[PDB]
Design a protein that fits this description.
Chain D: One of its GO terms (molecular function) is RNA binding. This is part of a larger assembly, with chains A (99 residues), B (194 residues), C (203 residues), D (148 residues) and E (51 residues). Chain D has five helices and five strands. Chain D is α/β, with parallel strands linked by helices. The chains are: A mainly alpha (99), B mainly alpha (194), C alpha+beta (203), D alpha/beta (148), E mainly alpha (51). The complex binds magnesium ion (MG) (35 copies). Chain C binds three RNA strands through helix 1, helix 3, helix 4, strand 3 and helix 6.
Chain lengths: 99, 194, 203, 148, 51
RNA sequence: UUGACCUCAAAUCAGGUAGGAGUACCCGCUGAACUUAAGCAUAUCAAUAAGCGGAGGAAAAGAAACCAACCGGGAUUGCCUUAGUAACGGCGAGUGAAGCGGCAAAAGCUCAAAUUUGAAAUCUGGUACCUUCGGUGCCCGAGUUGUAAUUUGGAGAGGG
RNA sequence: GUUCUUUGUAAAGUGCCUUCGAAGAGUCGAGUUGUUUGGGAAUGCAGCUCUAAGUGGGUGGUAAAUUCCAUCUAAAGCUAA
RNA sequence: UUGACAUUGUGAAGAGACGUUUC
């Protein structure tokens, strides 16, 4: 970003007086918004939990947050996707406990 | 079979290649078409000039960024900075490009410069019928060439700050290599605490 | 906007409200014919999303297709050939069942043009699809500048050529390095790099 | 042109040029590179050592001219400066009105040290130079300006 | 009480509920149609009402 | 007992549409072996022949879920080149592209998701009149399980 | 280049302020199978099984955990040369 | 031909896994 003007090394590149271009809304693609934030809430308490979700929280308050994650990674196909789901559980679990 | 002292050839003809031979016998007569249809385009385009006004653009890759190249369009930043709308700019002789941004002032400034210099050099005819005729100029690109900038003068002063340029590169490279390693040995300096 | 709710409700296919719905509907759809005319898009939020519009000239069909691999229709297993091509039982169709769905309704309604389709249910034996069609000689569309494009002859049986949405999927049209063959069109791009170009003054 | 061809000379002699005992049959020994490791081995070793087996590292999706770094030797260098303009700088021999040569603009990517140049200062701008190339420049009253 | 598909309307009592909104699952999707000079109307709800 | 609605039917109902042919070139499906490897099964021939479905005057692709790692580039197609190269391969026979660069041609876009809610503002048809590739009025129907208008990410929307 | 028409109080563009900014699911993705590709711990395609998310998702030609960076905005569509 | 998963749902006896729950 702050280019050294030399053609190799730890930030190589010719020096250019820079601009910083107007930000694209496309880069805000997955952006939340109160709209969806609301509807997705309302569908949750209407539709309810799903099968694997029901066992997911079960592994949580039992055989650790660990073992639950490994299942969740197998079940959803990605580690990252699993952690983000296991997290979502803990917040549901949070609600049930301390209301 | 194999014999004699010859190079090993690799001629891919084991596949019914003759079903697919394209012999450009029409190279000649197609030039005539490509003309005759440029000619008759140039007509009904009234006095307009066949081609759009196109930007300067630096050209990508370490191989090629030394040169400068006509880009596709003008950004939206350059068009408003030229004091006109993109939507209207298209209807004149100008090419716009909504994807493609400015992170280099010296290409921006020199591109808004083209836009200004272009307007000033064309006459946009009024919306009714009657006009001041004007002859027909065919190329915008001939008229507004793109040239490569100035980088330096014919001569200057020798200035030797003593640093060898080789070694500057060497140390520069070593820097890269171990930065990660060093990023580690340091982390364990924080972790080396009581 | 009741749609945004449906879009997000439809996502919870393992919820009892939806399990129950799916369970009762896949039975109903089975007792009807393999192909039948549908009253109105069971997924109004979905038909819509794919370009369907509730008016005179938009038709919705539902269709059962049989699910699984393609058993090589060779007589008694006999391949008569090398051992590579001796396969029979693990061979997968290069198109998608949804393409088989689109194609089958489109021949029954050959007076309509196929716009798109979407899943609605499946079971061990069938995948279920609702297909959205459009009548190219019904004036409601012929005068509609948004959809008159499909009246053109160039879109005749577009689903049998893979110009539909599943059609462009299986045909592997997409930009990028992951699609070097299949993009400009598999075969066409093959014929390209397999053609010998000789100019008049040979190079 | 066929008129000059040997096969014109051969008409009327049986068997073309190809012999009576040994014919001109339809691929003795196999098509193309067949039996390289076998009956065509004596030719493959000698005339083509190294032909068989792997060697070195693989490189997926390699892009030539990521390595675009064409070379230039001091051996020339002064070619980069326009002829007529050259004489002028040659005698002026000054550290104060020294000529500038943008090698990267000339299309090069590294200066190498082959050969000798005259004691005249030159401002050489480039990416990468050899430890020896810049040594000679520096010793002729010039310097090296690293660019990109 | 008779909308097919039901998914059009299931989330309503709970949409109402969250907002306070009084609701009723009246009988008749064809009765609500008559109520707006049509054939069927699914839903119907007044907001203003003269005093 | 009366009138709606949903679904499903029937008519030589009112008007339409499909088939079949051609297939050099085009979009898919399906799919060999002869052959090459001096044998041969992987591989090769070949993602080819044959077989099937569907278009046009071109077809398809097309305004990036792209290329790049640059000072960045900017829909698609094509030619020159990349290059017989990176890579695949009993790493054998053999196969084998992409990015940049020059050129030809150039063109950009619209839906879904939004309360018109102070006015379904939209549309097929029948029917009368006219200036008939249609306009206007009337009537039935379609449509709120959403037809119009505004908005499509480059944005844009509501208010000042 | 002529002349009927018949459009207006209606359509559009631009400047600052502010608040919002809805963006496609049995999909993306993952496993496994077959097929294909120069694509090599897997290039595309398909079958079954699993099946998301919203500071998300995809890609970044060596698999994995972790931290950053970069680049576009999929699962709907039209379009001459 | 055998096993898993899918089609697959509701109530119990049990021996079992630490009033839910897989046999
Ligand atoms: Mg020809
Ligand atoms: Mg041109
Ligand atoms: Mg089957
Ligand atoms: Mg389609
Ligand atoms: Mg003789
Ligand atoms: Mg003789
Ligand atoms: Mg003889
Ligand atoms: Mg002999
Ligand atoms: Mg030998
Ligand atoms: Mg030399
Ligand atoms: Mg009739
Ligand atoms: Mg036909
Ligand atoms: Mg066979
Ligand atoms: Mg042959
Ligand atoms: Mg053989
Ligand atoms: Mg032989
Ligand atoms: Mg044999
Ligand atoms: Mg054939
Ligand atoms: Mg055919
Ligand atoms: Mg025709
Ligand atoms: Mg043409
Ligand atoms: Mg087309
Ligand atoms: Mg876009
Ligand atoms: Mg491009
Ligand atoms: Mg061998
Ligand atoms: Mg091949
Ligand atoms: Mg180019
Ligand atoms: Mg609209
Ligand atoms: Mg505003
Ligand atoms: Mg506006
Ligand atoms: Mg999208
Ligand atoms: Mg196949
Ligand atoms: Mg594979
Ligand atoms: Mg994709
Ligand atoms: Mg298209």
């Amino acid at each position: 970003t702050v280019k050294t003007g030399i053609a190799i090394g730890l930030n190589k590149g010719k020096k250019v007086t820079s601009m910083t271009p107007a930000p694209k809304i496309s880069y805000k693609k997955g952006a939340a918004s109160n709209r969806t934030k609301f509807v997705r809430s309302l569908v949750r308490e209407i539709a309810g939990l799903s099968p694997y979700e029901r066992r997911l929280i079960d592994l949580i308050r039992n055989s650790g947050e660990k073992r639950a994650r490994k299942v969740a990674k197998k079940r959803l196909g990605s580690f990252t996707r699993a952690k983000a789901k296991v997290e979502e559980m803990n917040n549901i679990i949070a609600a049930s406990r301390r209301h | 079979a194999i014999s004699k002292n010859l190079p090993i050839l690799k001629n891919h003809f084991r596949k019914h290649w003759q079903e697919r031979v394209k012999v450009h016998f029409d190279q000649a007569g197609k030039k005539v078409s490509r003309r005759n249809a440029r000619a008759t385009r140039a007509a009904k385009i009234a006095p307009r000039p066949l081609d759009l006004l196109r930007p300067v653009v630096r050209a990508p890759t370490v191989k090629y960024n030394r040169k400068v190249r006509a880009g596709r369009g003008f950004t939206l930043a350059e068009v408003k900075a030229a004091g006109l709308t993109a939507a209207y700019a298209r209807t004149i002789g100008i090419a716009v490009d909504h994807r493609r941004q400015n992170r280099n002032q010296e290409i921006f400034d020199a591109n808004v410069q083209r836009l200004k210099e272009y307007q000033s050099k064309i006459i946009v005819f009024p919306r009714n019928g009657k006009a001041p005729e004007a002859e027909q100029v065919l190329s915008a690109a001939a008229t507004f060439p793109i040239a490569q900038p100035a980088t330096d003068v014919e001569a200057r002063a020798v200035q030797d700050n003593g640093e060898s340029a080789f070694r500057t590169l060497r140390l520069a490279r070593s820097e890269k290599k171990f930065r990660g390693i060093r990023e580690k040995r340091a982390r364990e300096k924080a972790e080396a605490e009581a | 906007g009741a749609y945004k709710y449906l879009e997000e409700l439809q996502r919870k296919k393992q919820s009892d409200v939806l399990r129950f719905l799916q369970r009762v509907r896949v039975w109903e759809y089975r007792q009807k014919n393999v192909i039948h005319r549908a009253a109105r898009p069971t997924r109004p939020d979905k038909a819509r999303r794919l370009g369907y519009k509730a008016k005179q000239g938009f038709v919705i069909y539902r269709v059962r297709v049989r699910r699984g691999n393609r058993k090589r229709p060779v007589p008694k297993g006999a391949t008569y050939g090398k051992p590579t091509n001796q396969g029979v039982n693990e061979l997968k169709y290069q198109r998608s069942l949804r393409a088989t769905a689109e194609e089958r309704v489109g021949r029954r309604a050959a007076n309509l043009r196929v716009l798109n389709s979407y899943w609605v249910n499946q079971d061990s034996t069938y995948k279920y699809f609702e297909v959205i069609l459009v009548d190219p000689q019904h004036k409601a569309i012929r005068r509609d500048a948004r959809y008159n494009w499909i009246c053109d002859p160039v879109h005749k049986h577009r689903e049998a050529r893979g110009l539909t949405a599943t059609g462009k999927k299986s045909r592997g049209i997409n930009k990028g390095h992951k699609f070097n063959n299949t993009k400009a069109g598999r075969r066409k791009t093959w014929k390209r790099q397999n053609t010998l170009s000789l100019w008049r003054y040979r190079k | 042109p066929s008129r000059f061809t040997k096969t014109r000379k051969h008409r009327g002699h049986v068997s073309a040029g190809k012999g009576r005992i040994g014919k001109h049959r339809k691929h003795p020994g196999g098509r193309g590179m067949a039996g390289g490791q076998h009956h065509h081995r004596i030719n493959m070793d000698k005339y083509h050592p190294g032909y068989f087996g792997k060697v070195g590292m693989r490189y997926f999706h390699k892009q030539q001219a990521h390595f675009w770094k064409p070379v230039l030797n001091l051996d020339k260098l002064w070619t980069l400066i326009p002829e007529d303009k050259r004489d002028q700088y040659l005698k002026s021999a000054s550290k104060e009105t020294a000529p500038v040569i943008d090698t990267l603009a000339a299309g090069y990517g590294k200066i190498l040290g082959k050969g000798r140049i005259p004691n005249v200062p030159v401002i050489v701008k480039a990416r990468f130079v050899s430890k020896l190339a810049e040594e000679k420049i520096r010793a002729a009253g010039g310097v090296v300006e690293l660019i990109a | 009480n008779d909308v097919d598909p039901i998914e059009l309307v299931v989330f309503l009592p709970a949409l109402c509920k969250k907002m306070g909104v009084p609701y009723a699952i009246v009988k008749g999707k064809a009765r609500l149609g008559t109520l707006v000079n049509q054939k069927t109307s699914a839903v119907a709800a007044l907001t203003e009402v003269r005093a």
